[PDB]
RNA sequence: AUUGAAAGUUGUAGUAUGCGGUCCUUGCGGCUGAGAGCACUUCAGGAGUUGCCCGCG
């Protein structure tokens, strides 16, 4: 939720509304959002750790809960 | 957004190569299921009986 929002300026708040201070373009902000979201796909698939060439761990997701 | 903030203990690596469970070896030689032995002894197909009855080439 803070992607593209400067840490020091969560909101700019000049028209008396606390709308987010999105200093960057909203479209590429959303693009960064789905890029970060899709970065999780090669995480629970077998692309974690070292010795990938020689080991490539035998991986499978057992169970999970997300909110 | 906590003396926290940025961060791969990282990348490349075959225990591998040749190595006969191998060569010889009889389950072999001798050996009577053999000798004795009545399907024997008694025995009627048996006792009765009109080819029957009439006859002019």
Topology (SSEs and partners):
Elements lengths: L25 H14 L28
The chain binds one RNA strand of 57 nucleotides through loops.
PDB class: antiviral protein
Keywords: elongated Cascade complex, cascade, type I-A, antiviral protein
Entry title: elongated Cascade complex from type I-A CRISPR-Cas system
Features:
elongated, mainly alpha, 1 chains, RNA-binding
Q: Hey, roughly how much beta strand do the residues contain?
A: under 5%
Distance between the termini: 14 Å
> Helix/strand-derived class?
mainly alpha
How many helix segments?
A: 1
Order of helices and strands: H
Largest sheet descriptor? none
Count every beta strand, where a strand is a DSSP E run of 2 or more residues.
0
What global shape is seen? elongated
- Percent helix: 10-25%
Alpha-carbon Rg, integer: 19 Å
């Amino acid at each position: 939720g803070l992607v593209g929002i400067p840490q020091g300026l969560p909101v700019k708040f000049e028209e008396n509304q606390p709308r987010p201070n999105i200093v960057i373009d909203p479209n590429e902000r959303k693009a960064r959002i789905e890029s970060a979201l899709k970065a999780l796909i090669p995480m629970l698939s077998g692309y974690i750790g070292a010795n990938l060439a020689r080991s490539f761990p035998v991986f499978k997701v057992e169970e999970l809960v997300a909110i």
